[PDB]
Design an enzyme around this catalytic site. Structure first.
Site, PDB file in Angstrom:
ATOM      1  N   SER A   1      -0.511  15.674 -11.977  1.00 36.49           N
ATOM      2  CA  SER A   1      -0.749  15.318 -13.368  1.00 36.49           C
ATOM      3  C   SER A   1      -0.979  16.583 -14.185  1.00 36.49           C
ATOM      4  CB  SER A   1      -1.973  14.378 -13.469  1.00 36.49           C
ATOM      5  OG  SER A   1      -2.372  14.119 -14.753  1.00 36.49           O
TER       6      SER A   1
ATOM      7  N   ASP B   1       0.854  -1.202   0.000  1.00 36.57           N
ATOM      8  CA  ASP B   1       0.000   0.000   0.000  1.00 36.57           C
ATOM      9  C   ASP B   1       0.886   1.247   0.000  1.00 36.57           C
ATOM     10  OD1 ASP B   1      -1.908   1.901   0.308  1.00 36.57           O
ATOM     11  OD2 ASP B   1      -2.414   1.389   2.385  1.00 36.57           O
TER      12      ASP B   1
END
Length: 330
Positions: A199, A35
């Site tokens: 992004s 994770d």
């Protein structure tokens, strides 16, 4: 040193991925959910409340000649999905894919929430976010990656998740055979303890690319792609009959649909998520309404590039003094 382990989807939908981890002496092999959005290595154990264990493999520290109680240490964690676990702490030898750390903190669960009990395939979590998020008190502990880092050939690990197929976690090297083209690296902020990056924009299907900054985290422990509501609405508007369902808890679409791809930017590069990756199947057995793999991050407080996005790429988690992320097509 290096390590290399295969990671396997837990079910036909890729709801999560499990990776075998050796704990203790002699080895006890547990299947853990790696994770990158948390920083605790915790396991079902001989100490877990018996009614909360349903099929998981447990770690028994009393059977490990290298296990030591970390006296006084406790832990307690709550995840984004409402699940939780807590317990006490041992140090022990932990190996992943041939890479061994001695004195790793292994957080033994005394209590787990119902979603953990109900998932017989996940024996615990191995956190790969920054060690500033580790919940051990009163002495915070380091992740497996942070303990391994100095020994590795390069201070990196890579995530190569499969679509409906196994993939790979590598530690300490970049497998140049595992991706196409070049790796595009992008800046990371560690201020929230995550692999947080920005992004450069998105496209839906064959549509034009929209240049827009989207701050979010690269999180292997989250199944879906969670983005701002504007972006998510723009995606689902291209699917006839798709709608946001308050009763189901997100966007659903007709199981008869063919889904468009979704592209996200990494610098000047582009990662394309095929439409099939965005189908999470019927909302209940036999339903013709299917759950979408792209959902709104509104109310979660962060955008999450979970497995739907990461499995479309070869992803480098660069733990150099200034960390960075890398993305390649594959």
């Amino acid at each position: 040193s290096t390590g290399s382990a295969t990671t396997t989807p837990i079910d036909s939908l890729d709801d999560a991925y499990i990776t075998p981890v050796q704990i203790g002496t002699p080895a006890q092999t547990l299947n853990l959910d790696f994770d990158t959005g948390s920083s605790d290595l915790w396991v079902f154990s001989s100490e877990t409340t018996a009614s909360e264990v349903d099929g998981q493999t447990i770690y028994t520290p009393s059977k490990s000649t290298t296990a030591k109680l970390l006296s006084g240490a406790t832990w307690s964690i709550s995840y984004g999905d409402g699940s939780s676990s807590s317990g006490d702490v041992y140090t022990d030898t932990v190996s992943v894919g041939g890479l061994t750390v001695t004195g790793q903190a292994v957080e033994s669960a005394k209590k787990v929430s119902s979603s953990f009990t109900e998932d017989s395939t996940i024996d615990g979590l191995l956190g790969l976010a920054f060690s500033t998020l580790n919940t051990v008190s009163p002495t915070q502990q380091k992740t497996f990656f942070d303990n391994a880092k100095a020994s590795l050939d390069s201070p990196v690990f890579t995530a190569d998740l499969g679509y409906h197929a196994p993939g790979t976690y590598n530690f300490g090297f970049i497998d140049t055979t595992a991706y196409t083209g070049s790796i595009t690296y992008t800046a990371v902020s560690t201020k929230q303890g995550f692999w947080e990056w920005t992004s450069t924009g998105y496209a839906v299907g064959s549509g034009t690319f929209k240049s827009t900054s989207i701050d979010g985290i690269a999180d292997t422990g989250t199944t879906l792609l969670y983005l701002p509501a504007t972006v998510v609405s723009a995606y689902w508007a291209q699917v006839s009959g798709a709608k946001s369902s308050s009763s189901v808890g997100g966007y659903v679409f007709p199981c008869s649909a063919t889904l468009p791809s979704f592209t996200f930017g990494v610098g000047s590069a582009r990662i394309v998520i095929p439409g099939d990756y965005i189908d999470f199947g019927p909302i209940s057995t036999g339903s013709s309404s299917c759950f979408g793999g792209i959902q709104s991050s509104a109310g979660i407080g962060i955008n999450i590039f979970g497995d739907v996005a990461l499995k479309a790429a070869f992803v480098v988690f660069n733990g150099a003094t200034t960390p960075t992320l890398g993305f390649a097509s594959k």
